[PDB]
Design a protein around this nucleic acid. Structure first.
Ligand SMILES: [Mg+2]
Ligand SMILES: [Mg+2]
Ligand SMILES: [Mg+2]
Ligand SMILES: [Mg+2]
Ligand SMILES: [Mg+2]
Ligand SMILES: [Mg+2]
Ligand SMILES: [Mg+2]
Ligand SMILES: [Mg+2]
Ligand SMILES: [Mg+2]
Ligand SMILES: [Mg+2]
Ligand SMILES: [Mg+2]
Ligand SMILES: [Mg+2]
Ligand SMILES: [Mg+2]
Ligand SMILES: [Mg+2]
Ligand SMILES: [Mg+2]
Ligand SMILES: [Mg+2]
Ligand SMILES: [Mg+2]
Ligand SMILES: [Mg+2]
Ligand SMILES: [Mg+2]
Ligand SMILES: [Mg+2]
Ligand SMILES: [Mg+2]
Lengths: 206, 262, 153
RNA sequence: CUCUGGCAUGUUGGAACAAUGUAGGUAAGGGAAGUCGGCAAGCCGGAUCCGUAACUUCGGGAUAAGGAUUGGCUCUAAGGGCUGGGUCGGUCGCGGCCGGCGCCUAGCAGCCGACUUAGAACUGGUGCGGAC
RNA sequence: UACCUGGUUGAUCCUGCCAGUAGCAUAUGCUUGUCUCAAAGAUUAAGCCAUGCAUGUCUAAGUACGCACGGCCGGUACAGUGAAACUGCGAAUGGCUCAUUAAAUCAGUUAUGGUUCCUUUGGUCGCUCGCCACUUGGAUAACUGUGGUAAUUCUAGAGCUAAUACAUGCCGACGGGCGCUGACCCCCUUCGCGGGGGGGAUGCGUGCAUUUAUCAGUGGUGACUCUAGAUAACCUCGGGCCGAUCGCACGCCCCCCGUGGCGGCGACGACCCAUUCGAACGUCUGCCCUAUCAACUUUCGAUGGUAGUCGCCGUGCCUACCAUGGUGACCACGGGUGACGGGGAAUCAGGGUUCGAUUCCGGAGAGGGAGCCUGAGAAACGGCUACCACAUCCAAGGAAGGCAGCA
RNA sequence: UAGCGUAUAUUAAAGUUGCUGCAGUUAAAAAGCUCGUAGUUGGAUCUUGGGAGCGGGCGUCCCCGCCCUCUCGGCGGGGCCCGAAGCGUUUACUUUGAAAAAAUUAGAGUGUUCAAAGCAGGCCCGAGCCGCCUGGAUACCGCAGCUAGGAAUAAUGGAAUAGGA
RNA sequence: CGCCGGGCAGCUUCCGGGAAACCAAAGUCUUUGGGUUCCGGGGGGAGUAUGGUUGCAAAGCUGAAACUUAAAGGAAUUGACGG
RNA sequence: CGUCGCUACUACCGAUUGGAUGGUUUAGUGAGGCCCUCGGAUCGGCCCCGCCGGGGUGCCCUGGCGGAGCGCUG
């Protein structure tokens, strides 16, 4: 099949190398996983040594990490917006190791409300009446209020992050290897990395 | 090849096995075990070519199936079990135990040991680390691993493992002034006191060691096996006390023994 | 110019760029920590890699490569490639029949990190073996020695 | 093919749609077996990217030979021209005279305008130099 | 044993080759009484093969309701030996040959902190709080019975029957603890406030392994982005582990009692770690003849960079975008080889010159290519699939091939 | 001499391929001449001389000791002591050590009945010997790589507009 | 009339060499190594065939093989012969 | 010594778009395998839900016959 060998290549001098044996199994190559965005389908492939590799053919949920907040939640993938390797993979909507994507901010805002007790992603309020009043007030005692106001002074979110929170979609970078681990784990873009990537999307379109 | 080799040619066999070319094409390919096949001694050649208890491969298998040999206190039914270095081969039917120690000429010897001295074994720690739950682990040259070692033991040190318990009785640190035995290379089977250890970063260290006769010889660090404290060994020694004699003196030693016997 | 001249983003994977910079810490572009490691073997990490801003995953000091194996030496021949140079090693091969030597040379491709900024053609370079960085590169520059230079008129 | 301008089909019309002609096409399978002779017809053909032999008077041969591509639609990239770059009432002809009063100098800011080339995605019953 | 001798001339000194001389290594001729070893279809044809064999295997310890025998000792699950068959393991070693192969293989050296590893050995396996458990489900074998085909180790329909096969799934340890969330309450500096601390009702994860992100710095290297901790989570329905397994003797507790709970020796089986056997790709140096091969590689990766894909992993291994690089008279590239490489063999002053198909190590191949299934390990050929070349039987509808294994 | 002849490949002979070690006026042969990059090869010169008992005998023979620095000396304050760090170049060279499979080669032992071989084997038994003593060495293994000594020969450097110690 | 150095040479010599003719180089060579180029390997075929390259051509440079042969040659010696 | 004349042998040139055998390749067709996306010839489970038996007391324990949901599903 596909070959991972080195002896099919021209040598350093540019000369042509004559192979001394036929294709061996251990230097094989398998077709690209080509992960998509959709309902979870995973194919198990038996690999060298009798172990298993997971082909993430189609993925919908992904375990991402805020990083600066130590908040890691299982969100859903909206759609890939960029890929530094090849722009064709973006419009084909293919998930690879280092493609940046848009993810839902619903679990991230939920942790923000239940921990910091400050509004995030809210425009005017009075829109989640069965719960949001309870989580903002909580009628808690003096010690609990004095615990929440300790973290309120440093519960500050950079402008780029909160703006995407109002958008409902956060720019994240994948870190796992779909087709190898069968997952689409990653982290959330922020800081100079987010500012640089944002200029990349702006130059690409708009 | 397409897979692992399970045959061993007679000439390709290790030299210290003392196998001869004429008896057979093959050799007792040692099974996988605690010791490398290049440095082991399979049990078949122990009971046939050394102790003369059995004549061929079938007879030596008969004792194993009668369950009389207890390598390290455990019954081994493998005809080609790799014994290795400093292992108590105990046959309690004859009440005779052997410690498999190299002799002067770098070959495994028939070193009879007393039953009380046969209840323990020295081992060289090959690496130490910490596993799950912060539990320290230690492995030996005999491939046996123990949990909860004494923190004072570092790598390339010696421990006194106890049979039937698998615990530590005592340990010997590796430093200058300790009695060791070379377990590989040209000086294999020699005993001396550590004099110096030259550290070469990125490469193998070299240890200079001086025997009781004053002859000083070097070797690699991995070939160093400390077997005592100061000058007193912790185990019984084979005949010759681990000295090396140049060809001049064992010649006249043989002549003197022939003269005395004649 | 800067260190961002690619479609990806250059950063050191160990170093976390974002440290939750809030009012308690003056947000005046605080210096991000720089990951560096001593490599052993008596080689000193240069101040260029200590106080630099470049990103190079193949750097012996500020990258994910471990120097192990043979330490060789050579003379710089070509510097016309990105972050790699070609060195020439000259030796004598002995011909037993004639009891005489012959000059033979080998061109070796090594990876030159930008921490060695003032390398020039003809200078001595000591290199260290590592994992295969590219098709023909298996060595990293570890030290640079000038050849009767340091002065230019 | 059309506009301005011109014309009434070239010294007759009508009805039919036989043979034989004259002019023009198509033809299964074969492929010059036809014939003095490939006569006649047919094949090829534009442009882009490759690739081109013998021989040679070294200029040529040469569009040698041979091969791939070509539509529509949606974009992307490159290829230019114009002006303006001031640190300030220290004053008065919200603007004009000199100057203590300044560092674009890796060049920007705005406006304007041709065709041409290259790359990519999508797309059609594989059709695209669609006729000429 | 560091050796010469005849031949050009009428004769002589030379140059110079021819011839002689000795060894070994193939053939061949003549001859051959004994005895000990001992090569042996390599050379041309890695050409073609009839036939026969060369890989199968069970202990007390996975599954016996074959009468195919048999103790029955006779009122009982199975005495025992056990053919057949399922399951497991092996069949990837060996053996043969030297066609291919010229920095390729291979030899020494070194690295894998860049990987996988059946099995052996040693760790680990109540660490996890979560009306079958005194044992759960549906089949398939062999077996009886209907046959079809000219034929093959071809086999269908029908009916049972098993498991360490194939699945499911508890109890138990298990009392709780930890870290979050904290209903509230209490001791409080007490005062008209804060308060310095406790217990905690209610919900959330608790272990190992995997995939990310973050914090600090128990052990170890020469050097970790090492190991080990800490937090937030994920944990893939062709989906990880947390024993629904089998023999050997049989003994202990009897208060609750009198029918249950305990127990030793193993054997098999396991996610993970280490060890062993290794394997794979790398580092440095090293190869015959040829210039009537001087410039090659780069459109189809050539040389590097960035980011990915795949792989067991490191790398243009492949892809996208970039830079124009890389190797050569210190012989690149190309061609030839009647080249497998080496350990070695012959000749023997010294130096060298030839030979190494051949029993040891490494490599490659199984008529030529190619692609795969299973398995830890194969691009396997005494495994499969397709084409090419030969070639077997046919009732012409089909089927079956691989002796460079021993004869 | 139970072996000998022949053919052919190869080795010595062949100092007739010549590095050791050949030739080039006339035998075969130095380019018609010069320049010239690769290649090869390159003048002299930098520590010598003097010392202390051990000493090839101050026994004026000379084993020969030769009459680098700084850090805890691991036997925050003992002289009874000797380890952590670098070389006041880089190499080549030479010596030592480590690691270098076996077989084969040389070579130790061994009456195989001698030998080629092989790795065995020898001693007593008065018969209870209700078994003792051994061997299965060693050398060599190029070149490349590793380690520690020496610094003669050879190459390469330092301070010259002083951006010198 | 001398001396020095660089030249073209000459005479002589048992320096030494060489097969000798002869050579102060053709010496310092089995007592064999100052540095470094080119180049020969019995005689013919043959400086031919073929390939490449140069040239307007004539030709130049590079350059084999099959086959054939026991000598071909060098220097000296004696004789014989000479228009 | 050379031409010419005769006989053998060995290479060379040579029309023949000479022929044959290997090797590497541009272009075109292309078996088979592998992967991916569909595909669903069939084989089962639940929903049973037409009946009857019913049971702690038509409020069924369910043991069966059996329409079948003509759905959810492997
Ligand atoms: Mg008309
Ligand atoms: Mg008209
Ligand atoms: Mg037609
Ligand atoms: Mg037609
Ligand atoms: Mg005709
Ligand atoms: Mg006709
Ligand atoms: Mg015509
Ligand atoms: Mg033409
Ligand atoms: Mg198009
Ligand atoms: Mg061959
Ligand atoms: Mg061989
Ligand atoms: Mg094979
Ligand atoms: Mg298996
Ligand atoms: Mg095959
Ligand atoms: Mg010879
Ligand atoms: Mg000669
Ligand atoms: Mg001449
Ligand atoms: Mg020159
Ligand atoms: Mg000199
Ligand atoms: Mg010279
Ligand atoms: Mg000649």
């Amino acid at each position: 099949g596909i070959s991972r060998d080195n002896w099919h290549k021209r040598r350093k001098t540019g000369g042509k190398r004559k192979p001394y044996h036929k294709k061996r199994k251990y230097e094989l190559g398998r077709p690209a996983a080509n992960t998509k965005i959709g309902p979870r389908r995973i194919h198990t492939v038996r690999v060298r040594g009798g172990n298993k590799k997971y082909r993430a053919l189609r993925l919908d949920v992904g375990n991402f990490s805020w990083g600066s907040e130590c908040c890691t939640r299982k969100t859903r993938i909206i759609d890939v917006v960029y890929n530094a390797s090849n722009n064709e993979l973006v419009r084909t909507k293919t998930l690879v190791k280092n493609c940046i994507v848009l993810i839902d901010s619903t679990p991230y805002r939920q942790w923000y409300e239940s921990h910091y007790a400050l509004p995030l992603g809210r425009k005017k309020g009075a829109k989640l009446t069965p719960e949001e009043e309870e989580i903002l007030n909580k009628k808690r005692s003096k010690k609990i209020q004095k615990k929440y106001d300790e973290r309120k002074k440093n519960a500050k979110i950079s402008s780029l992050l909160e703006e995407q929170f109002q958008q409902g979609k956060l720019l994240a970078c994948i870190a796992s290897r779909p087709g190898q681990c069968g997952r689409a784990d990653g982290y959330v873009l922020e800081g100079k990395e987010l500012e640089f990537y944002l200029r990349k999307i702006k130059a690409r379109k708009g | 090849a397409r897979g692992p080799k399970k045959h061993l040619k007679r000439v390709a066999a290790p030299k210290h096995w003392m196998l001869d070319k004429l008896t057979g094409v093959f050799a007792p390919r040692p099974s996988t075990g605690p010791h490398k096949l290049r440095e082991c001694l399979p049990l078949i050649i122990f009971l046939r070519n050394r102790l003369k208890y059995a004549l061929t491969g079938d007879e030596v298998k008969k004792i194993c199936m009668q369950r009389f040999i207890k390598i390290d206190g455990k019954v081994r039914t493998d005809i080609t079990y790799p014994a290795g270095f400093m292992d108590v081969i105990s046959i309690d039917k004859t009440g005779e135990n052997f410690r498999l120690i190299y002799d002067t000429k770098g070959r495994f010897a028939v070193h009879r040991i007393t039953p009380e001295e046969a209840k323990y074994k020295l081992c060289k720690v090959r690496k130490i680390f910490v596993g799950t739950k912060g539990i320290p682990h230690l492995v030996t040259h005999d491939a046996r691993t123990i949990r909860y070692p004494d923190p004072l033991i570092k790598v390339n040190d010696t421990i006194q493992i106890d049979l039937e318990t698998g615990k530590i009785t005592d340990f010997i640190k590796f430093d200058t002034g300790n009695l060791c035995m070379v377990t590989g290379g040209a000086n294999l089977g020699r005993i001396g006191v550590i004099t110096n250890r030259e550290r070469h970063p990125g490469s193998f260290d070299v240890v200079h060691v001086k025997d009781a006769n004053g002859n000083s010889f070097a070797t690699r660090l991995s070939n160093i096996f400390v077997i005592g404290k100061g000058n007193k060994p912790w185990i019984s020694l084979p005949r010759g006390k681990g000295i090396r004699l140049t060809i001049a003196e064992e010649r006249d030693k043989r002549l003197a023994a022939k003269q005395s016997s004649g | 110019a800067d260190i961002q001249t690619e479609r990806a983003y250059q950063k050191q994977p160990t170093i976390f760029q974002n440290k939750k910079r809030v009012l308690l810490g003056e947000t005046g572009k605080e210096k991000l920590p720089r990951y560096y490691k001593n490599i052993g073997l008596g080689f000193k990490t240069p101040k260029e890699a200590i106080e630099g801003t470049y990103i190079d995953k193949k750097c012996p000091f500020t990258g994910n490569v471990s120097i192990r194996g043979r330490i060789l030496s050579g003379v710089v021949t070509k510097m016309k490639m990105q972050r790699t140079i070609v060195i020439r090693r000259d030796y004598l091969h002995y011909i037993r029949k004639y009891n005489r030597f012959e000059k033979r040379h080998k061109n070796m491709s090594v990876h030159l990190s930008p921490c060695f900024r003032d390398v020039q053609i003809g200078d001595i370079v000591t290199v260290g073996e590592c994992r295969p960085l590219s098709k023909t590169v298996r060595f990293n520059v570890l030290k640079v020695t000038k050849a009767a230079g340091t002065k230019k008129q």
